Swiss-Prot record, chains A, C, D, E, F:
Gene field: groES
GO terms of molecular function: ATP binding; identical protein binding; metal ion binding; protein folding chaperone; protein-folding chaperone binding; unfolded protein binding
PANTHER family for this protein: 10 KDA HEAT SHOCK PROTEIN, CO-CHAPERONIN GROES
Modified residues (N6-succinyllysine): K34
Organismal lineage: Bacteria, Pseudomonadati, Pseudomonadota, Gammaproteobacteria, Enterobacterales
GO cellular component annotations of the record: cytosol; GroEL-GroES complex
Subcellular location: Cytoplasm
Keywords: Chaperone, Cytoplasm
Alphabetized Gene3D superfamilies for the sequence: GroES chaperonin (2.30.33.40)
Family annotation (InterPro entries): Chaperonin_GroES, Chaperonin_GroES_sf, Chaprnonin_Cpn10_CS, GroES-like_sf
Alphabetized HAMAP family for the sequence: CH10 (MF_00580)
Stored NCBIfam families: PRK00364.1-1 (NF001526), PRK00364.1-2 (NF001527), PRK00364.2-2 (NF001531)
Organism of origin: Escherichia coli (strain K12)
Known partners and oligomeric status: Heptamer of 7 subunits arranged in a ring. Interacts with the chaperonin GroEL. Can form asymmetrical complexes, composed of one GroEL and one GroES, and symmetrical complexes, formed between one GroEL and two GroES oligomers. The asymmetrical complex is the functional unit. It was suggested that the symmetric heterooligomer may represent a transient intermediate in the chaperonin protein folding cycle. Another study shows that the symmetric heterooligomers are substantially populated only in the presence of proteins that cannot be folded by the chaperonin.
Protein name: Co-chaperonin GroES
The protein's role, per its UniProt record: Together with the chaperonin GroEL, plays an essential role in assisting protein folding. The GroEL-GroES system forms a nano-cage that allows encapsulation of the non-native substrate proteins and provides a physical environment optimized to promote and accelerate protein folding, probably by preventing aggregation and by entropically destabilizing folding intermediates. GroES binds to the apical surface of the GroEL ring, thereby capping the opening of the GroEL channel. Regulates the ATPase activity of GroEL.
Curated annotation (Swiss-Prot), chain B:
Known function: Together with its co-chaperonin GroES, plays an essential role in assisting protein folding. The GroEL-GroES system forms a nano-cage that allows encapsulation of the non-native substrate proteins and provides a physical environment optimized to promote and accelerate protein folding, probably by preventing aggregation and by entropically destabilizing folding intermediates.
Protein name, entry field: Chaperonin GroEL
Keywords: Acetylation, ATP-binding, Chaperone, Cytoplasm, Isomerase, Nucleotide-binding
Parent sequence residues shown: 177 to 351 of 548
Keyword Transit peptide attributed: no
Source species of the chain: Escherichia coli (strain K12)
GO cellular component: cytosol; GroEL-GroES complex; membrane
Transmembrane regions: none
Primary localization: cytoplasm
Family designation: Belongs to the chaperonin (HSP60) family.
């Protein structure tokens, strides 16, 4: 099973942290570092603000995105794997082609 | 002259450049026992400040990694963050690198650093001068045949440097 | 004597916290964590904002939802049972299967 | 691969910090400071707020701009370089001609 | 090379600092005070809040103004001299003649 | 050189502090207190905060007014005299007749 | 509780004594048992370790003041090798 986001919420999973290639040939072990990249697991119904209609999200399920790991980023236990929950606003950019 | 272990007198002679500083990473032993580090045709790095999360300076390390040669590091201190990745890197074979603390006291260690660098042909990274942690090419680093390191001592078999530089360093010592 | 939410509020109840089944068959002790899982006990009148109508809530009564516990979520006792009160906005996901 | 920011977000990169041109002929080294000017690498779709229309960004791609480096500025690695991500509101002015 | 401010941003220059003339004939030294007077070098497009095309700034280019120096005002130097960047809200008054 | 207020900004001057009439006949010395009354020297264009048009201020030049000496109240030197600058919102009342 | 129910029969005993003292004695314990010491410091993480990493012993004896391992299963080439570095 999986979750269905409650409007304006996007469910994403974080990509690998401190990927072995920092500064060059140097391989670096992960200590106190984190990654802002992720995948879009699910898309909410849309934003419900200003009452009129529901605006669709600009992110497609399965997209690769860049987001701000901020206050609005929530940690959820689904099945048994780490997921991130944030609004469309928290996702800064999309890695496309 | 020192007190001997036996009933007999014994003489010890030291060749080349050697100092009483040990290795920060006990874990990296290049080949022999006693924690000995033997780096062949290593590049020597000298700095005037410590390394922690300040690991960034990696392009310097990578250039050496690209080279495929061992790296010797002299600075006031090295912390576990750099050492942690470094121990893995040396064990896994990416780079054979060990770091040792610079001499003793403020003026004493940095005054001593220029001769080590000049002797090996390298350039001391002067924080003090228009130089920075990642600002410095691999060519800046000094060279030596090999080094020997143990828990309390660091030795360089022979740095590669010219006589005019060796003698000039000795000549400036006359004052 | 059950409860009906007061506009833009949803009454839900929390599911078990650190249930002893994580990862496998090994009992994971309670290490001071709480469950974000819940069921929607009641649905409020709706959003009264913008004076334009009074829009009904997306979440129907009896739904299974995922939400982030926060200041917005309030603790109330109804007939000596624990329930949670939060707005539609505070719910982050719907579990449908 | 480049990047594509998602609405209102602008991707810019910073100009050299304390370039050796301060005071005139004096070569000034950088000991602890930063640069206020950057280039707009990418333009988001526009602001999603107030449903009726999406407001396009005032800044075109490749623009040399002046911006307020604040909390709302994000740093990520694109093509092994750091880029700044901020909203349209964050960028104060454009150098023109 | 000169600068064009982005909507609602005004670029001004301060006149002079604690010039010795205050209080009368007497020349008063500067012990920690800064002038509040400025000249407007450039005018932004105008504020874009609430869709509505682009409402114009009340202050004309070359306008002599009085402003409140808060953290809103940002400092950069152009043509190797100090200039100020602030919104219309920061400027409190205009000196006409 | 007199002052020209700019939109929704009103320039007023403070009245004398702790005037010699407290407790009736008795005179109380001036020590650590400040007046809340002022006179309106200048009137701004008006509030521009709502789509179209500019709304007029309800205060006219020469009025005696009551105001909230808050964050939005500023002090300026005109011809070596103290003048206060604040929005109409900061002015609590008008002294009439 | 995990042990009392029967989910796992597991417990721990503190390392020999002090940083350099305990860390130094960890390598021999691991090699003797055929296991690998989790090097937080080098290239390992608390979660990161597989079951094979753990060493094996016939049985252990534990009391309020002492911990004993009757026989870890490891090869002599490794036992002697640990012993060989000991000669210095």
């Amino acid at each position: 099973m999986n979750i269905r986001p409650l409007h304006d919420r996007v469910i994403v999973k974080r990509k690998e942290v401190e990927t072995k290639s920092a500064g060059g040939i140097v391989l670096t072990g992960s200590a106190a570092a984190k990654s802002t990249r992720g995948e879009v697991l699910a898309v909410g119904n849309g934003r419900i603000l200003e009452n009129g209609e529901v605006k669709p999200l600009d992110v497609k399920v399965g997209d690769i995105v860049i987001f701000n790991d901020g206050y609005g980023v929530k940690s959820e236990k689904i099945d048994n794997e780490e997921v991130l929950i944030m609004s469309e606003s928290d996702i800064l950019a999309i890695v496309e082609a | 002259v020192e007190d001997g272990t036996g009933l007999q007198d014994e003489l010890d002679v030291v060749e080349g450049m050697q100092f009483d500083r040990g290795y920060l990473s006990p874990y990296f032993i290049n080949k022999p026992e006693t924690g000995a580090v033997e780096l062949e045709s290593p590049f020597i790095l000298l700095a005037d400040k410590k390394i922690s999360n300040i690991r960034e300076m990696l392009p310097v390390l990578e250039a050496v990694a690209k080279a495929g040669k061992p790296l010797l590091i002299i600075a006031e201190d090295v912390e576990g963050e750099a050492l942690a990745t470094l121990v893995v890197n040396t064990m896994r074979g990416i780079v054979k690198v060990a770091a040792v603390k610079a001499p003793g006291f403020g003026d004493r260690r940095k005054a001593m650093l220029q001769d080590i660098a000049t002797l090996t042909g390298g350039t001391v990274i002067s924080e003090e001068i228009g130089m920075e942690l990642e600002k410095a090419t691999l060519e800046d680093l000094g060279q030596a045949k090999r080094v020997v390191i143990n828990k309390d001592t660091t030795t360089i078999i022979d740095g590669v440097g010219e006589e005019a530089a060796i003698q000039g360093r000795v000549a400036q010592i006359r004052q």
